[PDB]
Coordinates of C-alpha atoms (C1' of nucleotides) in Angstrom, one line a residue:
Chain A
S1 CA -27.3 12.0 24.4
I2 CA -29.9 10.6 26.9
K3 CA -32.8 8.0 26.8
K4 CA -36.3 8.8 28.1
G5 CA -38.1 11.3 26.0
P6 CA -36.5 11.7 22.5
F7 CA -38.5 15.0 22.1
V8 CA -41.0 14.0 19.4
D9 CA -42.6 17.4 18.5
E10 CA -46.2 18.1 19.5
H11 CA -47.2 20.3 16.7
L12 CA -44.7 18.8 14.1
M13 CA -45.5 15.2 14.5
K14 CA -49.2 16.0 14.8
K15 CA -48.8 17.5 11.4
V16 CA -47.1 14.3 10.3
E17 CA -49.4 11.6 11.8
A18 CA -52.6 13.5 10.7
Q19 CA -51.1 14.4 7.4
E20 CA -49.9 10.8 7.2
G21 CA -53.4 9.7 6.4
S22 CA -52.6 8.5 2.8
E23 CA -49.3 8.0 1.0
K24 CA -49.5 11.8 0.2
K25 CA -46.2 13.1 1.4
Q26 CA -46.1 16.5 2.9
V27 CA -43.1 16.2 5.1
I28 CA -42.0 19.3 7.1
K29 CA -41.6 22.8 5.4
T30 CA -40.6 23.6 8.9
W31 CA -37.2 25.5 8.4
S32 CA -36.6 24.2 11.8
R33 CA -33.8 21.8 13.0
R34 CA -35.0 20.7 16.4
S35 CA -37.4 17.7 15.7
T36 CA -37.1 14.1 16.8
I37 CA -38.2 11.0 14.8
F38 CA -40.2 7.8 15.0
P39 CA -39.8 4.5 13.0
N40 CA -43.0 5.5 11.0
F41 CA -41.3 7.9 8.6
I42 CA -42.9 7.4 5.1
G43 CA -41.4 8.5 1.8
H44 CA -40.7 12.3 1.8
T45 CA -38.1 15.0 2.0
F46 CA -37.8 17.7 4.8
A47 CA -36.9 21.3 4.5
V48 CA -33.9 21.3 6.7
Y49 CA -32.5 24.8 5.4
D50 CA -33.7 28.4 5.4
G51 CA -32.2 30.3 2.6
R52 CA -35.1 31.2 0.3
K53 CA -36.8 27.7 -0.1
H54 CA -37.1 24.2 1.4
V55 CA -34.5 21.4 1.1
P56 CA -35.1 17.8 0.2
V57 CA -33.4 15.5 2.8
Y58 CA -32.6 11.8 3.4
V59 CA -35.8 9.6 3.8
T60 CA -35.0 5.8 4.2
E61 CA -32.9 4.2 6.8
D62 CA -30.8 7.3 7.5
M63 CA -28.7 8.3 10.5
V64 CA -30.3 6.3 13.4
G65 CA -29.0 7.9 16.7
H66 CA -29.9 11.4 15.8
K67 CA -32.8 13.8 16.5
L68 CA -32.3 16.4 13.8
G69 CA -31.4 17.1 10.2
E70 CA -27.8 15.7 10.4
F71 CA -27.5 15.3 6.5
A72 CA -29.0 18.6 5.3
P73 CA -26.8 20.8 3.1
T74 CA -26.3 24.5 3.7
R75 CA -22.7 24.8 2.6
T76 CA -19.3 23.2 1.8
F77 CA -15.7 24.1 0.7
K78 CA -16.7 27.4 -1.0
Chain B
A1 CA 4.0 -11.9 16.8
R2 CA 0.9 -14.2 17.2
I3 CA -2.0 -12.3 18.8
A4 CA -2.7 -10.3 15.7
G5 CA -0.4 -9.9 12.6
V6 CA 3.0 -9.8 14.2
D7 CA 4.4 -7.7 17.1
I8 CA 8.1 -8.2 17.5
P9 CA 9.7 -6.1 20.3
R10 CA 11.5 -7.6 23.2
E11 CA 12.9 -6.9 26.7
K12 CA 9.5 -5.4 27.7
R13 CA 6.3 -6.7 29.2
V14 CA 3.6 -8.3 27.0
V15 CA 0.8 -6.9 29.1
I16 CA -0.1 -3.7 27.3
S17 CA 2.6 -3.5 24.6
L18 CA -0.2 -4.5 22.1
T19 CA -0.8 -0.8 21.2
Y20 CA 0.4 -1.3 17.7
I21 CA -2.4 -3.5 16.3
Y22 CA -5.6 -1.5 15.8
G23 CA -8.6 -1.2 18.0
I24 CA -6.8 -2.1 21.3
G25 CA -3.4 -1.6 22.8
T26 CA -1.4 -1.3 26.2
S27 CA -4.4 0.2 28.2
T28 CA -7.0 -2.4 27.4
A29 CA -4.3 -5.0 26.6
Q30 CA -3.2 -4.9 30.4
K31 CA -7.0 -4.4 31.4
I32 CA -8.3 -7.4 29.3
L33 CA -6.1 -9.9 31.1
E34 CA -9.1 -12.0 32.0
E35 CA -7.8 -15.5 31.5
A36 CA -6.0 -18.4 33.3
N37 CA -2.4 -17.4 34.1
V38 CA -1.6 -14.7 31.4
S39 CA 0.5 -11.8 32.7
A40 CA 3.5 -9.6 31.9
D41 CA 6.8 -11.4 32.1
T42 CA 9.4 -9.0 30.8
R43 CA 10.6 -11.9 28.7
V44 CA 8.5 -11.5 25.5
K45 CA 10.5 -14.4 23.8
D46 CA 10.2 -16.9 26.6
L47 CA 7.9 -18.9 29.0
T48 CA 5.2 -19.2 26.3
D49 CA 3.8 -22.2 24.5
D50 CA 0.3 -23.2 25.1
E51 CA -0.9 -20.2 27.4
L52 CA -1.0 -18.1 24.2
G53 CA -3.3 -20.9 22.7
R54 CA -6.1 -20.2 25.4
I55 CA -5.4 -16.5 25.9
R56 CA -5.7 -16.3 22.1
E57 CA -8.7 -18.5 21.7
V58 CA -10.3 -15.9 23.8
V59 CA -9.2 -13.2 21.3
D60 CA -11.0 -15.2 18.7
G61 CA -13.9 -15.7 21.2
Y62 CA -13.5 -12.0 22.2
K63 CA -16.3 -11.2 19.7
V64 CA -15.5 -7.5 20.5
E65 CA -13.2 -7.5 17.5
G66 CA -10.2 -5.0 17.5
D67 CA -8.6 -5.3 14.2
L68 CA -11.6 -7.3 12.7
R69 CA -13.5 -4.0 13.8
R70 CA -11.0 -1.7 12.2
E71 CA -13.7 -1.3 9.5
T72 CA -16.3 0.0 11.9
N73 CA -14.6 3.3 11.3
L74 CA -15.1 2.8 7.5
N75 CA -18.7 1.4 7.9
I76 CA -20.0 4.1 10.3
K77 CA -18.5 6.5 7.7
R78 CA -20.5 4.4 5.0
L79 CA -23.8 5.2 6.9
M80 CA -22.9 8.9 7.1
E81 CA -22.1 9.4 3.4
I82 CA -25.1 11.6 2.8
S83 CA -23.2 14.8 4.0
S84 CA -24.1 14.2 7.6
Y85 CA -21.0 13.8 9.8
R86 CA -17.8 11.7 10.2
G87 CA -17.7 10.8 6.4
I88 CA -19.6 13.6 4.5
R89 CA -19.2 16.7 6.6
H90 CA -15.8 15.5 8.0
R91 CA -14.4 13.4 5.1
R92 CA -16.3 14.6 1.9
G93 CA -15.8 18.3 2.8
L94 CA -12.0 17.9 3.5
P95 CA -12.2 19.7 6.9
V96 CA -10.2 19.2 10.3
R97 CA -11.6 17.9 13.6
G98 CA -11.5 19.5 17.1
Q99 CA -14.2 21.8 15.7
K100 CA -11.3 24.2 15.6
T101 CA -10.5 22.8 12.1
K102 CA -8.0 25.8 11.7
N103 CA -7.2 28.2 14.4
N104 CA -4.3 26.2 15.9
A105 CA -1.7 24.0 14.2
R106 CA -2.9 20.8 12.3
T107 CA -0.7 17.9 10.8
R108 CA -2.8 14.8 10.6
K109 CA -5.5 15.9 8.1
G110 CA -3.5 18.9 6.8
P111 CA 0.1 17.7 6.8
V112 CA 1.4 20.7 4.9
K113 CA 2.8 23.8 6.7
Chain C
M1 CA 16.5 -37.2 -11.9
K2 CA 18.5 -34.1 -12.9
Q3 CA 19.8 -32.6 -9.6
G4 CA 21.3 -29.1 -9.2
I5 CA 18.5 -26.8 -8.4
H6 CA 16.4 -27.1 -5.2
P7 CA 18.1 -28.0 -1.8
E8 CA 16.7 -30.6 0.7
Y9 CA 13.0 -30.7 1.4
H10 CA 10.5 -33.5 1.9
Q11 CA 7.2 -34.2 3.8
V12 CA 6.7 -33.4 7.6
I13 CA 4.3 -34.0 10.5
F14 CA 1.8 -31.4 11.9
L15 CA -1.3 -31.8 14.2
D16 CA -3.6 -29.0 14.8
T17 CA -6.3 -28.1 17.4
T18 CA -8.7 -29.9 15.1
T19 CA -8.4 -33.0 12.8
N20 CA -4.6 -32.5 12.6
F21 CA -4.8 -31.7 8.9
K22 CA -1.4 -30.5 7.7
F23 CA 0.9 -33.3 6.5
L24 CA 1.7 -32.4 2.9
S25 CA 5.2 -31.6 1.5
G26 CA 7.4 -29.4 3.6
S27 CA 10.8 -27.7 4.2
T28 CA 10.2 -27.0 7.8
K29 CA 12.7 -27.6 10.5
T30 CA 12.1 -27.8 14.3
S31 CA 12.3 -30.2 17.3
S32 CA 10.5 -33.5 17.4
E33 CA 7.4 -34.0 19.5
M34 CA 6.6 -37.8 19.3
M35 CA 6.5 -39.8 16.1
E36 CA 3.9 -42.2 14.5
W37 CA 3.1 -44.5 11.6
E38 CA -0.2 -42.8 10.6
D39 CA 2.1 -40.0 10.2
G40 CA 5.9 -39.3 10.5
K41 CA 8.1 -41.7 12.2
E42 CA 10.7 -38.9 12.2
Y43 CA 11.2 -35.4 13.6
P44 CA 7.4 -34.3 13.9
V45 CA 7.9 -30.5 14.3
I46 CA 5.8 -29.0 11.6
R47 CA 3.9 -27.1 14.4
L48 CA 0.3 -26.2 14.0
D49 CA -1.9 -24.2 11.5
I50 CA -5.4 -22.9 10.9
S51 CA -5.8 -25.7 8.4
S52 CA -8.9 -27.1 10.1
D53 CA -9.6 -24.9 13.1
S54 CA -12.2 -22.6 11.4
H55 CA -12.4 -21.3 7.9
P56 CA -14.3 -18.1 7.1
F57 CA -15.1 -19.6 3.7
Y58 CA -17.9 -22.3 4.2
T59 CA -18.8 -20.8 7.6
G60 CA -20.5 -18.2 9.7
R61 CA -19.6 -15.5 12.3
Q62 CA -20.8 -12.3 14.0
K63 CA -22.3 -9.4 12.2
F64 CA -21.7 -5.7 11.5
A65 CA -22.5 -2.6 13.5
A66 CA -26.2 -2.5 14.0
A67 CA -29.7 -1.6 12.6
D68 CA -32.0 1.3 13.2
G69 CA -32.2 0.8 17.0
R70 CA -34.9 3.4 17.7
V71 CA -37.5 0.6 17.7
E72 CA -36.8 -0.8 21.2
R73 CA -37.7 2.3 23.2
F74 CA -34.5 4.1 22.1
Chain D
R1 CA -1.0 -35.5 -0.1
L2 CA -1.4 -32.6 -2.6
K3 CA -0.1 -34.6 -5.6
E4 CA -2.5 -37.2 -4.7
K5 CA -5.0 -34.5 -3.8
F6 CA -4.5 -33.8 -7.5
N7 CA -6.1 -37.3 -7.5
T8 CA -7.9 -37.8 -4.2
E9 CA -11.0 -35.9 -5.4
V10 CA -10.6 -35.4 -9.1
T11 CA -10.1 -38.6 -11.0
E12 CA -13.8 -39.5 -10.9
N13 CA -15.0 -36.0 -11.6
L14 CA -12.3 -35.4 -14.3
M15 CA -13.6 -38.7 -15.6
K16 CA -17.2 -37.5 -15.6
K17 CA -17.3 -33.7 -15.6
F18 CA -17.5 -33.7 -19.4
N19 CA -18.8 -37.0 -21.1
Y20 CA -16.3 -36.9 -23.9
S21 CA -15.4 -40.0 -25.9
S22 CA -12.4 -41.6 -24.2
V23 CA -10.9 -41.0 -20.7
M24 CA -8.1 -38.9 -22.2
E25 CA -10.1 -36.1 -24.0
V26 CA -11.5 -35.7 -20.5
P27 CA -8.6 -33.8 -19.0
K28 CA -6.5 -33.4 -15.9
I29 CA -5.2 -30.2 -14.2
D30 CA -3.2 -27.9 -16.4
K31 CA 0.3 -27.1 -15.5
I32 CA 1.4 -24.0 -13.5
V33 CA 4.1 -21.2 -14.1
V34 CA 4.8 -20.1 -10.4
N35 CA 6.3 -16.5 -11.1
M36 CA 7.2 -13.6 -8.8
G37 CA 7.8 -10.0 -9.3
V38 CA 9.3 -6.7 -8.0
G39 CA 8.6 -3.0 -8.1
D40 CA 12.3 -1.9 -7.6
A41 CA 15.0 -2.4 -10.3
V42 CA 17.9 -2.8 -7.8
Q43 CA 17.8 -4.1 -4.2
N44 CA 14.2 -5.3 -3.6
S45 CA 14.7 -7.3 -6.8
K46 CA 18.2 -8.4 -5.9
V47 CA 16.9 -9.3 -2.4
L48 CA 13.6 -10.9 -3.4
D49 CA 15.4 -14.1 -4.5
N50 CA 14.6 -16.7 -1.8
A51 CA 10.7 -16.4 -1.4
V52 CA 11.0 -19.0 -4.3
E53 CA 13.2 -21.2 -2.1
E54 CA 10.1 -20.8 0.2
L55 CA 7.4 -21.3 -2.3
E56 CA 8.8 -22.7 -5.7
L57 CA 11.7 -25.2 -6.4
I58 CA 13.7 -23.0 -8.8
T59 CA 16.9 -21.7 -7.3
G60 CA 16.5 -18.4 -9.3
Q61 CA 16.8 -17.6 -13.0
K62 CA 17.2 -14.1 -14.3
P63 CA 14.6 -13.3 -16.9
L64 CA 13.6 -9.7 -17.6
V65 CA 10.7 -7.8 -19.2
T66 CA 10.3 -8.5 -23.0
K67 CA 7.6 -6.1 -24.2
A68 CA 9.1 -3.4 -22.1
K69 CA 7.4 -0.1 -23.0
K70 CA 8.5 3.4 -22.1
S71 CA 9.3 2.7 -18.4
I72 CA 8.9 -1.0 -17.9
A73 CA 12.1 -2.1 -19.5
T74 CA 15.2 -3.3 -17.7
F75 CA 17.7 -6.1 -18.2
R76 CA 18.7 -9.3 -16.4
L77 CA 17.1 -8.5 -13.0
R78 CA 15.5 -11.5 -11.2
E79 CA 11.9 -10.1 -11.1
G80 CA 10.2 -13.1 -12.9
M81 CA 11.7 -16.6 -11.9
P82 CA 10.6 -19.4 -14.4
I83 CA 9.3 -21.8 -11.7
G84 CA 6.7 -23.3 -14.0
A85 CA 5.2 -26.7 -12.8
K86 CA 6.7 -29.4 -15.2
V87 CA 5.9 -32.6 -13.3
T88 CA 7.9 -32.9 -9.9
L89 CA 7.1 -29.3 -8.7
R90 CA 3.9 -29.3 -10.7
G91 CA 2.4 -29.6 -7.2
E92 CA 3.9 -26.2 -6.1
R93 CA 3.1 -23.4 -3.7
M94 CA 0.1 -23.0 -5.9
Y95 CA -2.4 -25.7 -4.8
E96 CA -1.4 -25.0 -1.2
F97 CA -4.8 -23.5 0.0
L98 CA -3.0 -20.9 2.1
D99 CA -5.0 -18.3 0.3
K100 CA -7.6 -18.5 3.3
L101 CA -4.9 -17.2 5.7
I102 CA -6.1 -13.7 4.8
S103 CA -9.9 -13.9 5.0
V104 CA -10.3 -11.2 2.3
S105 CA -11.1 -11.4 -1.3
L106 CA -11.6 -15.1 -1.5
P107 CA -14.5 -15.0 -4.2
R108 CA -13.1 -12.0 -6.2
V109 CA -15.2 -12.4 -9.4
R110 CA -18.2 -14.0 -11.0
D111 CA -15.9 -16.0 -13.2
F112 CA -12.2 -16.2 -14.0
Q113 CA -11.1 -15.8 -17.7
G114 CA -12.0 -15.3 -21.3
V115 CA -8.4 -16.2 -22.1
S116 CA -7.9 -19.8 -20.9
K117 CA -4.6 -18.7 -19.2
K118 CA -5.9 -18.0 -15.7
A119 CA -4.3 -15.7 -13.3
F120 CA -4.7 -16.3 -9.5
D121 CA -3.0 -13.5 -7.6
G122 CA -2.1 -13.8 -3.9
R123 CA -2.1 -10.0 -3.8
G124 CA -1.0 -8.6 -0.4
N125 CA 0.6 -11.1 1.9
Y126 CA -1.9 -13.8 1.1
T127 CA 0.6 -16.5 0.3
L128 CA 3.8 -18.0 1.8
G129 CA 2.3 -16.9 5.2
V130 CA 3.2 -20.0 7.3
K131 CA 6.6 -18.1 7.5
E132 CA 6.6 -15.3 9.9
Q133 CA 7.1 -11.8 8.7
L134 CA 10.9 -11.6 9.3
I135 CA 12.2 -10.5 5.8
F136 CA 8.9 -11.2 3.9
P137 CA 7.3 -8.1 5.4
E138 CA 8.6 -5.8 2.7
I139 CA 7.8 -5.1 -1.1
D140 CA 6.9 -8.4 -2.8
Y141 CA 5.0 -8.9 -6.2
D142 CA 3.4 -12.2 -7.4
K143 CA 2.4 -13.6 -10.9
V144 CA 0.4 -16.9 -10.6
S145 CA -0.8 -17.1 -14.3
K146 CA -1.5 -20.4 -16.0
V147 CA -4.1 -22.1 -18.1
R148 CA -6.7 -24.7 -16.9
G149 CA -8.2 -27.8 -18.5
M150 CA -11.3 -26.2 -19.6
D151 CA -11.8 -24.1 -22.8
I152 CA -13.9 -21.4 -21.1
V153 CA -15.1 -20.6 -17.5
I154 CA -18.1 -22.8 -18.0
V155 CA -17.2 -26.4 -17.0
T156 CA -14.0 -25.0 -15.4
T157 CA -16.4 -23.5 -12.8
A158 CA -18.8 -25.9 -11.0
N159 CA -16.2 -28.6 -10.4
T160 CA -13.4 -26.1 -9.4
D161 CA -13.7 -27.2 -5.7
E162 CA -9.9 -27.8 -5.7
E163 CA -9.0 -24.2 -5.0
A164 CA -12.5 -23.3 -4.1
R165 CA -12.3 -19.7 -5.5
Chain E
rU1 C1' -13.5 26.7 62.5
rC2 C1' -16.6 23.4 60.0
rC3 C1' -17.3 20.6 52.6
rC4 C1' -14.4 20.2 48.1
rA5 C1' -9.3 15.8 51.7
rU6 C1' -4.9 11.5 46.6
rA7 C1' -5.5 18.3 46.6
rA8 C1' 0.4 18.2 42.8
rA9 C1' 5.3 17.2 43.8
rG10 C1' 10.8 16.9 46.6
rU11 C1' 8.3 10.9 50.8
rU12 C1' 9.8 3.5 48.9
rG13 C1' 8.7 4.8 43.8
rU14 C1' 5.1 -0.9 40.9
rU15 C1' 5.1 -0.1 35.0
rC16 C1' 7.6 0.5 29.5
rU17 C1' 16.8 -1.1 28.8
rC18 C1' 16.7 4.3 23.4
rA19 C1' 13.3 0.5 17.6
rG20 C1' 9.4 6.6 16.8
rU21 C1' 9.9 1.9 20.6
rU22 C1' 3.4 0.3 27.1
rC23 C1' 6.1 8.8 26.3
rG24 C1' 1.7 10.5 23.2
rG25 C1' -4.4 11.4 23.8
rA26 C1' -3.4 15.3 17.8
rU27 C1' -6.8 12.4 13.2
rU28 C1' -8.3 8.3 9.2
rG29 C1' -11.8 6.0 14.2
rU30 C1' -16.2 4.2 18.8
rA31 C1' -17.5 9.1 21.4
rG32 C1' -19.2 10.1 26.1
rU33 C1' -19.9 12.7 32.5
rC34 C1' -25.2 16.1 33.1
rU35 C1' -28.2 21.7 33.6
rG36 C1' -30.5 23.0 27.8
rC37 C1' -37.0 25.6 23.5
rA38 C1' -32.8 22.1 18.9
rA39 C1' -23.7 19.7 18.0
rC40 C1' -24.3 18.8 9.9
rU41 C1' -20.1 22.5 8.8
rC42 C1' -22.5 25.9 15.4
rG43 C1' -15.7 25.1 20.9
rA44 C1' -14.0 21.3 24.7
rC45 C1' -10.7 17.9 26.8
rU46 C1' -11.1 13.4 26.4
rA47 C1' -11.6 7.2 28.4
rC48 C1' -13.0 2.8 25.0
rA49 C1' -7.0 4.6 24.5
rU50 C1' -6.5 6.3 17.0
rG51 C1' 0.0 5.6 19.5
rA52 C1' 0.8 11.1 16.0
rA53 C1' 3.8 15.9 16.9
rG54 C1' 8.4 14.6 18.9
rC55 C1' 15.3 13.2 20.8
rU56 C1' 17.7 20.9 22.3
rG57 C1' 16.8 24.1 18.4
rG58 C1' 17.9 28.8 12.6
rA59 C1' 17.1 34.3 8.4
rA60 C1' 12.8 32.9 13.2
rU61 C1' 11.7 32.0 21.0
rC62 C1' 10.0 31.5 26.9
rG63 C1' 10.9 32.8 34.6
rC64 C1' 15.5 35.7 36.8
rU65 C1' 18.8 37.5 44.6
rA66 C1' 14.1 34.0 47.5
rG67 C1' 9.4 30.0 48.0
rU68 C1' 7.4 34.4 43.1
rA69 C1' 8.5 30.8 39.0
rA70 C1' 10.3 25.6 37.6
rU71 C1' 5.1 21.8 37.0
rC72 C1' 0.6 21.6 38.4
rG73 C1' -2.2 23.1 42.8
rU74 C1' -8.9 23.3 46.6
rA75 C1' -12.0 25.3 43.4
rG76 C1' -14.7 28.3 41.0
rA77 C1' -16.3 34.9 40.3
rU78 C1' -19.0 35.0 35.0
rC79 C1' -23.0 32.0 34.5
rA80 C1' -28.5 25.9 32.9
rG81 C1' -21.3 22.2 29.6
rC82 C1' -16.6 24.8 29.4
rA83 C1' -9.9 28.0 31.3
Chain F
rG1 C1' 36.7 33.4 -56.7
rC2 C1' 34.2 31.9 -51.8
rG3 C1' 32.5 27.4 -49.8
rG4 C1' 32.7 22.1 -49.9
rU5 C1' 34.9 17.8 -51.2
rC6 C1' 39.7 14.1 -52.7
rG7 C1' 40.8 6.8 -50.0
rC8 C1' 37.7 2.2 -49.1
rC9 C1' 32.3 -0.5 -48.2
rU10 C1' 26.1 -0.9 -49.4
rC11 C1' 21.7 0.5 -52.2
rC12 C1' 18.7 3.5 -56.2
rU13 C1' 19.4 5.9 -61.0
rA14 C1' 21.3 1.3 -64.6
rA15 C1' 16.6 0.1 -69.6
rA16 C1' 15.3 -8.9 -66.3
rA17 C1' 23.7 -11.2 -68.2
rG18 C1' 28.3 -8.2 -66.9
rG19 C1' 29.7 -3.0 -67.4
rU20 C1' 27.8 2.2 -67.5
rA21 C1' 27.9 9.5 -66.3
rA22 C1' 26.5 14.4 -63.5
rC23 C1' 28.7 19.9 -57.7
rG24 C1' 22.4 13.2 -59.1
rG25 C1' 19.2 10.9 -54.1
rA26 C1' 20.5 8.1 -49.1
rG27 C1' 23.6 5.9 -45.2
rG28 C1' 28.6 4.1 -43.2
rC29 C1' 34.4 2.8 -42.2
rG30 C1' 40.3 4.4 -40.2
rC31 C1' 37.5 -1.4 -35.8
rU32 C1' 36.3 -4.8 -32.2
rC33 C1' 36.5 -10.0 -30.0
rA34 C1' 40.4 -15.1 -25.7
rA35 C1' 35.5 -14.5 -26.2
rA36 C1' 31.6 -12.7 -30.4
rG37 C1' 37.1 -18.2 -32.8
rG38 C1' 37.2 -24.4 -33.9
rU39 C1' 34.4 -29.0 -32.4
rU40 C1' 30.0 -32.1 -30.2
rC41 C1' 25.5 -31.8 -28.2
rC42 C1' 20.7 -28.9 -26.8
rC43 C1' 17.0 -25.3 -27.8
rU44 C1' 13.7 -21.1 -30.9
rC45 C1' 10.9 -15.1 -34.0
rA46 C1' 7.8 -10.6 -34.1
rG47 C1' 3.0 -7.4 -34.1
rA48 C1' -1.6 -10.5 -29.3
rA49 C1' -4.7 -9.7 -25.5
rU50 C1' -5.3 -12.1 -20.7
rG51 C1' -5.7 -9.4 -15.1
rG52 C1' -1.2 -10.8 -11.7
rU53 C1' 3.4 -5.6 -4.6
rU54 C1' 3.0 -3.1 -8.2
rG55 C1' 0.5 -1.6 -12.5
rG56 C1' 3.7 4.3 -15.7
rA57 C1' -1.8 1.6 -21.7
rA58 C1' 4.1 -0.8 -21.1
rA59 C1' 7.6 -3.5 -13.7
rU60 C1' 6.7 -10.9 -14.9
rC61 C1' 6.5 -15.6 -16.2
rA62 C1' 3.2 -18.5 -18.7
rU63 C1' -0.9 -19.7 -22.6
rU64 C1' -2.7 -19.8 -27.2
rC65 C1' -3.4 -16.2 -32.5
rA66 C1' 1.8 -16.3 -33.5
rU67 C1' 4.8 -16.9 -40.7
rA68 C1' 10.1 -14.3 -40.4
rG69 C1' 6.4 -8.6 -40.2
rA70 C1' 12.1 -11.3 -35.2
rG71 C1' 17.1 -11.5 -34.1
rU72 C1' 22.1 -11.2 -36.0
rG73 C1' 29.1 -6.4 -32.2
rU74 C1' 29.1 -2.5 -36.1
rA75 C1' 25.5 1.2 -42.4
rA76 C1' 23.1 -1.3 -46.5
rA77 C1' 21.6 -5.1 -49.7
rG78 C1' 21.8 -10.5 -50.6
rG79 C1' 20.8 -14.7 -47.5
rC80 C1' 19.5 -18.2 -42.9

RNA sequence: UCCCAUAAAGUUGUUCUCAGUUCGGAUUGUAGUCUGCAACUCGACUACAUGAAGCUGGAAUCGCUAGUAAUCGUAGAUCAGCA
RNA sequence: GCGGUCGCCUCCUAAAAGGUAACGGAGGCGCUCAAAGGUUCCCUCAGAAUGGUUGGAAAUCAUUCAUAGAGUGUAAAGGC
């Protein structure tokens, strides 16, 4: 990938930083797999799936070079 | 024989014939010849007493590891074992690589045809 | 002494990069360098070891892959 | 060297590590039983006979499995040579500190043994390594099991600086 | 005409005397040229070279009387990646 | 009648000496060994777990709990 503008979302990270007032964790709900991340991620899921819900995801010191939901299940073997 | 583990063969040139031992081999071996008088001699069992000492003290001072970093494979897998990639979505899911897991032939991950 | 088991083997001489610390019992044959009285006055050709060059044991070295990294401008 | 290194550090500690009554209740090093093994019943066992000429002092006896359950049992093969340290070789390939010539699994455990008979296994190619891998780069099993001069792990432990593991 | 100009070989052929051996670019690896509103299962081939498939071929397979093909070949029509 | 047995060795029945029957209940023998024979030395059993390429819970030598619960060329008792 490239440097220079990791693509922190405007709407999404607005929803974060202004919904990151307290410890109350409302993370994404976004059913969207396009974000990009800061060091200030504070304990919460994501929803990095769109089947009929919203999927909890990795929170602490996860994959560090990525800009999306690299760990989020949708499928496997069968 | 001495640079890492052992490497026996003869009659050939020591410059890149390092390919056996992990991390590095031949290509980098003949491209990392950055020392004081180390070079391919076609006599892998001659001409060498202390030159190996210095051009090995480098390999220990070559903090870029090689064999010692054989485990960066395993440890970058260790980071990914949350079903991400190269360890969970490529090792815990038992799939192939090339992102043609199976449309062509495959022996290394699936050895059974 | 009851002989009829092990062959011929005694002490030898070996000097290292550091401190020259390998002089215990041996069975090692090779060609003499130059002999002493602080150590062998005989074929000195136990060669050289890691015996005192660096241990990993009570020592330090370089670390693993890396940290988060998206903290210094990414 | 080593035989005196079974003295150079230890006579004062092994005269103090305990605070027993007389010098002789306060022990020395317990003797060793340098033993090797095999995982083949024929040729690796028939051709793993010298590595003792390398490490031990015994020419090579031919003891076999005794307890010998369903598929352990065989006869007369030289899988376990009785090269136990009596007094002369009681400074054998054991107290050679060539277990650092691996740089893996130095401190294996929090402790060693609830049975005083300790086992210290150079598993892999940890030991006899000052010899290049000519014929020693094939199948080779070890069996370094012997007791020490301490009833449990406790005082055995924080004076064990001899073999430092 | 005028830019891709070593275009790749037959032109001297550095380099590895038959051990899977300095032949390898497959996976158990590190991943990358730059034009994307976002490579976890959502292609690459790769160099940093992981040294594997391999040593002539079955009940199971490939050009053929001139430059066509053996081998590739300047590139790209198609189109913000790649024959 | 058919079938099966017919000689020699060990134990139980057999009632604390010996002996003692039935188509009563169990096993064996028709050898083997120059050494497994004679003599002088020298040594020591099981069921026990240790954590030791390897582990087949059992591939090893130790260590200690080890009381004959081991081993005797061959079945069984009496013995060591």
